[PDB]
Amino acid sequence: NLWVTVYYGVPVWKDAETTLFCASDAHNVWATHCCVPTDPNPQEIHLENVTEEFNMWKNNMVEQMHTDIISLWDQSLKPCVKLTPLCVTLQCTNVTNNITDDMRGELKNCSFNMTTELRDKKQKVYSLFYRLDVVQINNKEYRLINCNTSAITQACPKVSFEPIPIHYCAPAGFAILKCKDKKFNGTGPCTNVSTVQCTHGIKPVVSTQLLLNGSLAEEEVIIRSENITNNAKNILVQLNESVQINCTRPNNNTVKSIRIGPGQWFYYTGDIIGDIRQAHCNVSKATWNETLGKVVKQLRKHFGNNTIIRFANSSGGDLEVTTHSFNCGGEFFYCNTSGLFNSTWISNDSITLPCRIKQIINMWQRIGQAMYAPPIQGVIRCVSNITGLILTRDGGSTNSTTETFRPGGGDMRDNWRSELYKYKVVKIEPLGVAPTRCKRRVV
Amino acid sequence: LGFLGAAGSTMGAASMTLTVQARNLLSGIVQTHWGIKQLQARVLAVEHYLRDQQLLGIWGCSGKLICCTNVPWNSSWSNRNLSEIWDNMTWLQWDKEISNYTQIIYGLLEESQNQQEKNEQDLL
Amino acid sequence: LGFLGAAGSTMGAASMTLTVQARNLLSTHWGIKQLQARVLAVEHYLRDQQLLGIWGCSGKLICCTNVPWNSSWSNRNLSEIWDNMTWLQWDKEISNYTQIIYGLLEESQNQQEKNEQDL
Amino acid sequence: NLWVTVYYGVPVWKDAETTLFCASDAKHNVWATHCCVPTDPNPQEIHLENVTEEFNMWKNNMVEQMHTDIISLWDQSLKPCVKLTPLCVTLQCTNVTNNITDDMRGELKNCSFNMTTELRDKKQKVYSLFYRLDVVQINNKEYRLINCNTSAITQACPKVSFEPIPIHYCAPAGFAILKCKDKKFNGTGPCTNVSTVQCTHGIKPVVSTQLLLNGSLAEEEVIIRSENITNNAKNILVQLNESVQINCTRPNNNTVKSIRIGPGQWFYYTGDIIGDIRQAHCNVSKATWNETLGKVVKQLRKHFGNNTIIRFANSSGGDLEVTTHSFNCGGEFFYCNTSGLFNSTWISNDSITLPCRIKQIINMWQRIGQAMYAPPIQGVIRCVSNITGLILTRDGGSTNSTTETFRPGGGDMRDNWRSELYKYKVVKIEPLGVAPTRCKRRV
Amino acid sequence: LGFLGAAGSTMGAASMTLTVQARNLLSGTHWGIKQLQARVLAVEHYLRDQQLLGIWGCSGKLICCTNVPWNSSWSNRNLSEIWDNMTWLQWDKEISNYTQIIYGLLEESQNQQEKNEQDLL
Amino acid sequence: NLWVTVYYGVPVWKDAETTLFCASDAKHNVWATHCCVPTDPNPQEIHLENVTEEFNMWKNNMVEQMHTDIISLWDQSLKPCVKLTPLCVTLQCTNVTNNITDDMRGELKNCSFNMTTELRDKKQKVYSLFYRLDVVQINNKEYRLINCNTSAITQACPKVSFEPIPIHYCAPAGFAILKCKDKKFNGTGPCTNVSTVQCTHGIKPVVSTQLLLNGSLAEEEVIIRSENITNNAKNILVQLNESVQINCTRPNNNTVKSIRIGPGQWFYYTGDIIGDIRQAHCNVSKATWNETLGKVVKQLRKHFGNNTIIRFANSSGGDLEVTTHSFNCGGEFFYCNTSGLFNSTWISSNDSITLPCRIKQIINMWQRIGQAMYAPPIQGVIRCVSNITGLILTRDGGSTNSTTETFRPGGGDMRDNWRSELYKYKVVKIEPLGVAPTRCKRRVV
Ligand SMILES: *[C@@H]1O[C@H](CO)[C@@H](O[C@@H]2O[C@H](CO)[C@@H](O[C@@H]3O[C@H](CO[C@H]4O[C@H](CO)[C@@H](O)[C@H](O)[C@@H]4O)[C@@H](O)[C@H](O[C@H]4O[C@H](CO)[C@@H](O)[C@H](O)[C@@H]4O)[C@@H]3O)[C@H](O)[C@H]2NC(C)=O)[C@H](O)[C@H]1NC(C)=O
Ligand SMILES: *[C@@H]1O[C@H](CO)[C@@H](O[C@@H]2O[C@H](CO)[C@@H](O)[C@H](O)[C@H]2NC(C)=O)[C@H](O)[C@H]1NC(C)=O
Ligand SMILES: *[C@@H]1O[C@H](CO)[C@@H](O[C@@H]2O[C@H](CO)[C@@H](O)[C@H](O)[C@H]2NC(C)=O)[C@H](O)[C@H]1NC(C)=O
Ligand SMILES: *[C@@H]1O[C@H](CO)[C@@H](O[C@@H]2O[C@H](CO)[C@@H](O)[C@H](O)[C@H]2NC(C)=O)[C@H](O)[C@H]1NC(C)=O
Ligand SMILES: *[C@@H]1O[C@H](CO)[C@@H](O[C@@H]2O[C@H](CO)[C@@H](O)[C@H](O)[C@H]2NC(C)=O)[C@H](O)[C@H]1NC(C)=O
Numbered sequence A: 001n002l003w004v005t006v007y008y009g010v011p012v013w014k015d016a017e018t019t020l021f022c023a024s025d026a027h028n029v030w031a032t033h034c035c036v037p038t039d040p041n042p043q044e045i046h047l048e049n050v051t052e053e054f055n056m057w058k059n060n061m062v063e064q065m066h067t068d069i070i071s072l073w074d075q076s077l078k079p080c081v082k083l084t085p086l087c088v089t090l091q092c093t094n095v096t097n098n099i100t101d102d103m104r105g106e107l108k109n110c111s112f113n114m115t116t117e118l119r120d121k122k123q124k125v126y127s128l129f130y131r132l133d134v135v136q137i138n139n140k141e142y143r144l145i146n147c148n149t150s151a152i153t154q155a156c157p158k159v160s161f162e163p164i165p166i167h168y169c170a171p172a173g174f175a176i177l178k179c180k181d182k183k184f185n186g187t188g189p190c191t192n193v194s195t196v197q198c199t200h201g202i203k204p205v206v207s208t209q210l211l212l213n214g215s216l217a218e219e220e221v222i223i224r225s226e227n228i229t230n231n232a233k234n235i236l237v238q239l240n241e242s243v244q245i246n247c248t249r250p251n252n253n254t255v256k257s258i259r260i261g262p263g264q265w266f267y268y269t270g271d272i273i274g275d276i277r278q279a280h281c282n283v284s285k286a287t288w289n290e291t292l293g294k295v296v297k298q299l300r301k302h303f304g305n306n307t308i309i310r311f312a313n314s315s316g317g318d319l320e321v322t323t324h325s326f327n328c329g330g331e332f333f334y335c336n337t338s339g340l341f342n343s344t345w346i347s348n349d350s351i352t353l354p355c356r357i358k359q360i361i362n363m364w365q366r367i368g369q370a371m372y373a374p375p376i377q378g379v380i381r382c383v384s385n386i387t388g389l390i391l392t393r394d395g396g397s398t399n400s401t402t403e404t405f406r407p408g409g410g411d412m413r414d415n416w417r418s419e420l421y422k423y424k425v426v427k428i429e430p431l432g433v434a435p436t437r438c439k440r441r442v443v
Numbered sequence B: 001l002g003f004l005g006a007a008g009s010t011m012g013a014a015s016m017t018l019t020v021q022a023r024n025l026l027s028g029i030v031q032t033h034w035g036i037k038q039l040q041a042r043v044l045a046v047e048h049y050l051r052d053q054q055l056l057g058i059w060g061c062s063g064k065l066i067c068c069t070n071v072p073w074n075s076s077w078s079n080r081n082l083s084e085i086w087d088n089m090t091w092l093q094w095d096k097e098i099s100n101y102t103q104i105i106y107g108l109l110e111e112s113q114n115q116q117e118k119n120e121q122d123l124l
Numbered sequence C: 001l002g003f004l005g006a007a008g009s010t011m012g013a014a015s016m017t018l019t020v021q022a023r024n025l026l027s028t029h030w031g032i033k034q035l036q037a038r039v040l041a042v043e044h045y046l047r048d049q050q051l052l053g054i055w056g057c058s059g060k061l062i063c064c065t066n067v068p069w070n071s072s073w074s075n076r077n078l079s080e081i082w083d084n085m086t087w088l089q090w091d092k093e094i095s096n097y098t099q100i101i102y103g104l105l106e107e108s109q110n111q112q113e114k115n116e117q118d119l
Numbered sequence D: 001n002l003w004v005t006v007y008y009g010v011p012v013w014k015d016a017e018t019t020l021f022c023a024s025d026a027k028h029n030v031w032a033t034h035c036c037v038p039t040d041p042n043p044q045e046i047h048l049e050n051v052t053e054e055f056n057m058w059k060n061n062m063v064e065q066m067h068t069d070i071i072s073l074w075d076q077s078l079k080p081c082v083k084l085t086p087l088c089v090t091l092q093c094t095n096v097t098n099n100i101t102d103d104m105r106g107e108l109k110n111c112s113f114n115m116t117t118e119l120r121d122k123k124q125k126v127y128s129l130f131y132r133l134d135v136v137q138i139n140n141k142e143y144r145l146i147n148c149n150t151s152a153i154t155q156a157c158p159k160v161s162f163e164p165i166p167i168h169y170c171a172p173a174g175f176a177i178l179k180c181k182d183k184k185f186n187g188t189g190p191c192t193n194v195s196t197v198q199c200t201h202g203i204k205p206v207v208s209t210q211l212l213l214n215g216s217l218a219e220e221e222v223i224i225r226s227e228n229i230t231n232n233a234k235n236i237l238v239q240l241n242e243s244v245q246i247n248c249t250r251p252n253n254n255t256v257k258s259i260r261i262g263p264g265q266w267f268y269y270t271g272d273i274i275g276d277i278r279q280a281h282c283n284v285s286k287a288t289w290n291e292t293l294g295k296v297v298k299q300l301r302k303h304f305g306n307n308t309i310i311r312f313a314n315s316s317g318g319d320l321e322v323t324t325h326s327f328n329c330g331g332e333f334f335y336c337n338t339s340g341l342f343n344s345t346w347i348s349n350d351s352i353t354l355p356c357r358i359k360q361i362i363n364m365w366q367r368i369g370q371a372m373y374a375p376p377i378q379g380v381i382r383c384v385s386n387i388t389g390l391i392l393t394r395d396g397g398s399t400n401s402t403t404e405t406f407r408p409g410g411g412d413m414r415d416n417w418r419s420e421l422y423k424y425k426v427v428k429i430e431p432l433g434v435a436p437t438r439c440k441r442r443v
Numbered sequence E: 001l002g003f004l005g006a007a008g009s010t011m012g013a014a015s016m017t018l019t020v021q022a023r024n025l026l027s028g029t030h031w032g033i034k035q036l037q038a039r040v041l042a043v044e045h046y047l048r049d050q051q052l053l054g055i056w057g058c059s060g061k062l063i064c065c066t067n068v069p070w071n072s073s074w075s076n077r078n079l080s081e082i083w084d085n086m087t088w089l090q091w092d093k094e095i096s097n098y099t100q101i102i103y104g105l106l107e108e109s110q111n112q113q114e115k116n117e118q119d120l121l
Numbered sequence F: 001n002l003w004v005t006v007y008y009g010v011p012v013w014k015d016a017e018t019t020l021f022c023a024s025d026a027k028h029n030v031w032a033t034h035c036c037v038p039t040d041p042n043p044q045e046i047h048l049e050n051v052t053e054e055f056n057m058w059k060n061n062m063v064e065q066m067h068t069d070i071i072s073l074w075d076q077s078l079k080p081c082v083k084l085t086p087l088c089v090t091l092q093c094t095n096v097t098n099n100i101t102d103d104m105r106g107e108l109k110n111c112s113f114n115m116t117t118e119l120r121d122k123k124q125k126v127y128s129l130f131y132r133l134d135v136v137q138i139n140n141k142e143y144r145l146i147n148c149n150t151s152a153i154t155q156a157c158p159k160v161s162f163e164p165i166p167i168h169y170c171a172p173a174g175f176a177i178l179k180c181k182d183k184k185f186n187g188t189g190p191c192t193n194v195s196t197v198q199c200t201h202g203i204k205p206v207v208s209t210q211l212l213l214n215g216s217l218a219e220e221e222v223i224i225r226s227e228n229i230t231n232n233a234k235n236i237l238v239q240l241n242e243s244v245q246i247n248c249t250r251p252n253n254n255t256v257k258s259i260r261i262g263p264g265q266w267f268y269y270t271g272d273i274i275g276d277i278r279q280a281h282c283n284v285s286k287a288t289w290n291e292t293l294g295k296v297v298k299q300l301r302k303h304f305g306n307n308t309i310i311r312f313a314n315s316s317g318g319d320l321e322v323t324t325h326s327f328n329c330g331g332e333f334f335y336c337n338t339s340g341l342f343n344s345t346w347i348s349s350n351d352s353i354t355l356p357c358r359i360k361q362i363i364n365m366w367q368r369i370g371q372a373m374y375a376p377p378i379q380g381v382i383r384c385v386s387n388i389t390g391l392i393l394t395r396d397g398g399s400t401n402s403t404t405e406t407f408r409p410g411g412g413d414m415r416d417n418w419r420s421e422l423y424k425y426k427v428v429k430i431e432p433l434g435v436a437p438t439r440c441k442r443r444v445v
């Protein structure tokens, strides 16, 4: 009765992994890379009667995100002035004047020899450094902290790294499926799915401990975790309300520069204008307490209402392991959140978090060439929105019904999973067959 | 309707949306080692397009979005009525259901077309 | 005659040189640009071939279609178009009505494809 | 009545920008190495009967590629050459006074410095002669090379030739080159003597400022072309219909010396001179030049009126690259005075010697960045070149006095190639189209 | 037999393997470029053959009769020798100096045929 | 009464060279890193019945990729490694007499210099042992390294393995590889036992001079192949049907020291030697060698006459790269003497022969003037055993018709090493379209 009929242009697809295009809305690094415009605005086709499975922890879009961000970064530093000539013995003293007690020992006044553009001529340099970038050799002799492990390169002062939003676009033959179910927890079937050509804009914001300047959850705190009962996994907490945080490095500065080589310029500090104070960030405690209450009741959904949830500080490690970390106006801040994660939940009033500043940056947890951040003239202040948190369980319980949670942090991929969880990439497969009462006519 | 808007539609309902589905396979007209990555992506799109076109040519369906063949449908693959298949089932569901017979049908279709051309030589 | 040679004559005359024109289409830093150029030529070729397939007459140099000609595009008579105009002039004359036809051709192609299935 | 008929292989086209490739018309030079692709045994030009087409040399894109290609090639060829960072040392210099014609007082200086040998610890005292044009005072005084405060210095490789052998540009598949053969084509607008071709003729990538050497000639009369005739913000290009020869020399007999300054790293220097010191210079017939100007002023009056007076004056000032006639002769770089060529008023041996300067370190392309350095050339240099055209400018600020002074012009290197490229346009071939007919598909 | 298994077989016998041969033609920083160049040229060759069959009106066939007569100046061998004794490798050598001629005979007869058909609708 | 018929999918081809790609089976080995592409299971072959093809191993240009890609990979591997530029300083050296066999004859030197450390203002006195072959006197005497006047020296990365693994070469779509199975094939001419494969078996990229190690053996008999038999300027490639084992040792116990020369830049050096000092050497059974030569001389005579005398001798001279048997054993570079091996006349418990070997650290790899490689010392004692599978020989020529000829070890060209494995393969391009006559005219409706 039935015969095989071949149909081409069949609207079906398979899971697939491909290369994506980066595009943006028309000197930074991002816009000079993601040069493909997102300027036109076609939107999406909702798929009626389509259920599809998503898994944010098994996605590869995040790998492409991670890889390309790092590669872009390296390309941007590639053509900049090297600091090799700076790996010399430094003679340093302490800073005792015009400084508060809390800052004593943080800064050092160093003096050293440097070359000039002529090979047989040298100059003395006087500059001020943070102790985090300088170690003792054993007034005392010091060296820069990374001259024993890797080359140090100065980032170009005219290159902006501002994380403008970027969009990813499918290559022809592929499509991006998007889950818009407000209750989606990161895995499994989603029944409200639309198809798009490009993702919405995502800002490639880099941070530790807290998730800044991302999307908010819709009407609830959503906690997404690959393995809920496994303390080896972190959890991503998405808030439906932002929390405002005001950060600054309040002291005024000077920026000086010298020529070391043939058009090779180096930037450094000199003096602090006014006195010396600690960098810090301000959050109202009222909003912080409200935020935690929302998070805590959400956590209890997996532990029981009667569970006591305690917060505590980081377990230990380097600054990129234990502190909050972000770029504010081009500067690199490390903030102590131990006084933030200090409550226990049992069934303006601001908080100031002290912060440290560091100029030699080991990015991506990749030991290799270090980046040097030249100083910024003036006083830096910025305001950011906290949109989520990275936390961990201690685990190792005795079923006490009480558990302490710690700020997490670690991998950077997680910073993008929080935005990319909604997207899936598939390959279109237009060819297929089906039965029909139609025999080919043979002549 | 729109591209892939027919994905949740029944197989029958979706049979009339094939032109958009086919046209957009070549939509990538308008659009460092980065350039190399994208260059390969373009090459792959071409390679996929061509393997499907060659196969339709092999089966004698080069001029058709929809072609009847002389390979009978085998009820052992899916012993279900035509009415369910076209009016209730969607193409996504259908494809999953017959995903383990693809290697059979391609072989049957290749030889069936070869047989017809060979048989034509007795006319010529 | 010569490739692009017929451009000096009428639309009608040029109909026998279509295979001339159809023949040359497939004729460390630096090589990147050259390889991309080769890719683009292929993409343009394939697009046009796909469109002819979309519009039914995939194998013809010339095909009549089932889309009627509109006087709103051109109301000039054939006795003047085919004999007095060149293809360049013609293309310039109807340059607004391209993107619409491409769509009309699917409409006038797929209906008969359906009315071939019920055999 | 009428139906749409689809045609494929239709002989029509559209203006386009695509990438062209180069070919060499039949042995270490850069041009031959790069344009390794052979040219056709003979291109054919197909005339198009009954056509008119519009060309515009100032809106061309072929020139942009030529510019890009020449810079790319230039740099790629210099990438593997010896870097001369070791020369940026304090120099001890005095004037050369023996056997010097008074016109050459100053100019050369006798410098001495301590150069690094292939071993790091050993140094040599090296003596050499440099032109003052490449050397500045630091303040038997201390001196440095002019570019040690700006950029890297690279020695151009002595084994690499830059002879501007003519290169042909060829269309990629799907594209064609149109050529304008009209005798009077002024660089813009409709052209009726139109033909098509696969490739252009060979164009010699000759580089010069002010006066154009070894280019094409006008076929009937001197023709002057400009983007905007009445706008003094634009230059004018004069294509002569007859060539004028210019004889250029560097009379001093140079002895080349060299030193190994690294592991197979060789530096070449000027050594000393055999015989008396004389200045470089160029010879042009006066009568020939005067006749040439006559031919030019006749064309200029076509735009300005019978009653006008055309005066010529010298350049306005600036870098040697713009104030002098900058060109390569025998591998050496000449910066010749041209005031003697532009000192006359036209109202409605018999030769001139132009003095020339020689400069070794060059900021080619008007780029700020690394500068090439010519190696010294052994012996005495002589060449004879053909003057084929000029770059000129209007004075501007006219009071309608009927007298106008023209000044030597100059400009971007692209303008030197527009001189050939005004004859060409590139288009894309578009084989599909439709037309009406009394023919319905036989459905 | 399998891909190229028919290479030593006679011309007639070899007509039975035309689709294995067809399928295996298509279903395939300095390093990456060498690979891409190979892939691109394979496509270009593929397309030329398809284009040419299209030019001749043979795109829908593995084998097509044409309107161009066979010449004794190319081969004066018996039809039975050609199909029953000879192989395609031998044959290709035998007529290797005429293929470039034949191609344009096919082009013209196809153009005349399409024109004749156009005149009838 | 016949018509032209066009046929597509015709199983024919044209000879052609194209780009080949590599693959390998089955962890910092450079070969594996590059040939990351997997191989498939072995059923990639069809025998071609009724096909005779002409092969020519010396006109086979796939070997050119072997001698291009191998070079490229080598340089790619060294590209990111530590530069030794800062070490080109005046050295002050003396001899060593401590527990040394007399026959070292000053091979090693006790030498020191002022090295620049990671802080630019500091020096470190460094003491180490050097081979005489790496060091040239300037004139505690002053010396410099041999290559500081010619090129940069780069230290090879100690974490990268260079052990050759079999590499398979695979055809791109549209191409196929024709394999000759004729056991008597002499490198050229028609072959009737021809099969087609899409990818070859793997060949280890072993690099050596004079003697060919770890290759394939001939079946049944020794086969001698050359481009022009009576032209004494050609290399003779001898493929043995039995291997000969050779035991190569660098017997002294070693210490490897390292110093930081820059910001994460480490240099490795020799320290001192544990125990007394002995010469490097290789051991070959004399009888096995003598039997091997007997097989070879019979095969040589069949092309020169069977009334001749075959003589073996060492090379005429040149640098170590051509006068010695050059090879990599355990990562170390050996330059072994062969004059006592090639010392014979043939006229119509093991008793092995020990050959002395020299060791070098500064290497002019590929006999290419350009960047030099520095081989860091290897901790411990090295011993390896290799399979001698063939020879490279040349003749003196200059015949006086004395029915006597002298054969000497040849070498230098590396392509010739791979030809010994590649002679069985040819690459062709498929041409599926063609025409033939028929009784059928196109039917026109
Ligand atoms: C989370 O998201 C918020 C925004 O929603 C980000 O906040 C922005 O941060 C950047 C960087 O610190 C701010 O940019 C700076 O603004 C200064 C103030 O602007 C003056 O000038 C403008 C005109 O351009 C006036 O309209 C305005 O009233 C002020 O008078 C500038 O002075 C700064 O200039 C410096 O950088 C530029 C490079 O762009 C150089 O060219 C200058 O010479 C100079 O060095 C700079 O432009 C921005 O204003 C903030 N936006 C808002 C709304 O506050 C957070 O940073 C982000 N958080 C994270 C973690 O990503
Ligand atoms: C720059 O280098 C010079 C040496 O060239 C240092 O000067 C020496 O300092 C020590 C310690 O005070 C004295 O004992 C020496 O006599 C000084 N030598 C000379 C030539 O002056 C100088 O201190 C270094 N300066 C900096 C800022 O590092
Ligand atoms: C999604 O499924 C619904 C049914 O759940 C489809 O609704 C049908 O719509 C047609 C046209 O209006 C009616 O004739 C049918 O009677 C409706 N079905 C039922 C059960 O009432 C809807 O069209 C589907 N969407 C898509 C894109 O196919
Ligand atoms: C290889 O060649 C032999 C002939 O030498 C082929 O054998 C013939 O096969 C046909 C099959 O139709 C028989 O009718 C003939 O009688 C056979 N000839 C003889 C002398 O016995 C063989 O088939 C060829 N094989 C391949 C793969 O081409
Ligand atoms: C080459 O090395 C091998 C070891 O890999 C030697 O083989 C051994 O020889 C001894 C006799 O001296 C036997 O007792 C062992 O059983 C053999 N071992 C193996 C694995 O076969 C071989 O003799 C050496 N050849 C030369 C010339 O030195």
Ligand SMILES: *[C@@H]1O[C@H](CO)[C@@H](O)[C@H](O)[C@H]1NC(C)=O
Pocket (backbone or CB within 6 Å): A093, A094, A104, A105, A106
């Ligand atoms: C400088 O400050 C640090 C931190 O307070 C302290 O450890 C160190 O001893 C101080 N050194 C001097 C100069 O007293």
Ligand SMILES: *[C@@H]1O[C@H](CO)[C@@H](O)[C@H](O)[C@H]1NC(C)=O
Pocket (backbone or CB within 6 Å): A218, A219, A220, A221, A240, A241, A294
């Ligand atoms: C955030 O979630 C809480 C808990 O579901 C809800 O009470 C609150 O109104 C939500 N806030 C917003 C802005 O939607």
Ligand SMILES: *[C@@H]1O[C@H](CO)[C@@H](O)[C@H](O)[C@H]1NC(C)=O
Pocket (backbone or CB within 6 Å): A313, A338, A339, A340, A342
């Ligand atoms: C938590 O709050 C108590 C209030 O008495 C304070 O003593 C303690 O130091 C705080 N802990 C942290 C980490 O800030």
Ligand SMILES: *[C@@H]1O[C@H](CO)[C@@H](O)[C@H](O)[C@H]1NC(C)=O
Pocket (backbone or CB within 6 Å): B072, B074, B076, B077, B104, B108
């Ligand atoms: C149908 O399927 C059965 C096995 O279920 C198999 O034996 C038979 O050969 C198949 N027929 C066709 C035409 O595929």
Ligand SMILES: *[C@@H]1O[C@H](CO)[C@@H](O)[C@H](O)[C@H]1NC(C)=O
Pocket (backbone or CB within 6 Å): B081, B083, B084, B085, B087, B088
């Ligand atoms: C398929 O067959 C069953 C059993 O006869 C029947 O109930 C069902 O309605 C048929 N399917 C459709 C879609 O009609």
Ligand SMILES: *[C@@H]1O[C@H](CO)[C@@H](O)[C@H](O)[C@H]1NC(C)=O
Pocket (backbone or CB within 6 Å): C077, C078, C079, C080
């Ligand atoms: C076309 O129309 C013109 C009037 O503009 C008329 O002169 C000419 O004969 C017409 N051609 C025909 C016969 O269709």
Ligand SMILES: *[C@@H]1O[C@H](CO)[C@@H](O)[C@H](O)[C@H]1NC(C)=O
Pocket (backbone or CB within 6 Å): D090, D091, D092, D112, D113, D114, D125, D126
């Ligand atoms: C070389 O160095 C010495 C330092 O002892 C200095 O006096 C001399 O002037 C230098 N020579 C030159 C030519 O610069």
Ligand SMILES: *[C@@H]1O[C@H](CO)[C@@H](O)[C@H](O)[C@H]1NC(C)=O
Pocket (backbone or CB within 6 Å): D314, D315, D316, D317, D318, D323, D339
């Ligand atoms: C032009 O000539 C005058 C007179 O000799 C001179 O003063 C002026 O500097 C010259 N300008 C240039 C650019 O040569």
Ligand SMILES: *[C@@H]1O[C@H](CO)[C@@H](O)[C@H](O)[C@H]1NC(C)=O
Pocket (backbone or CB within 6 Å): F095, F105, F106, F107
């Ligand atoms: C060092 O050894 C060499 C042999 O390699 C010898 O010629 C030289 O005289 C020896 N020098 C001393 C000081 O023993």
Ligand SMILES: *[C@@H]1O[C@H](CO)[C@@H](O)[C@H](O)[C@H]1NC(C)=O
Pocket (backbone or CB within 6 Å): F092, F112, F113, F114, F125, F126
């Ligand atoms: C380092 O240089 C000094 C120069 O005063 C010399 O005496 C010393 O021996 C050198 N060190 C070495 C290891 O050669």
Ligand SMILES: *[C@@H]1O[C@H](CO)[C@@H](O)[C@H](O)[C@H]1NC(C)=O
Pocket (backbone or CB within 6 Å): F219, F220, F221, F222, F241, F242, F295
């Ligand atoms: C090697 O060749 C010789 C002579 O050709 C023969 O006697 C011997 O048996 C062969 N050995 C093997 C393993 O085939």
Ligand SMILES: *[C@@H]1O[C@H](CO)[C@@H](O)[C@H](O)[C@H]1NC(C)=O
Pocket (backbone or CB within 6 Å): F228, F229, F230, F231, F232
């Ligand atoms: C091969 O060598 C012989 C002897 O050297 C010579 O006569 C001959 O010309 C060479 N070439 C050939 C194969 O003819």
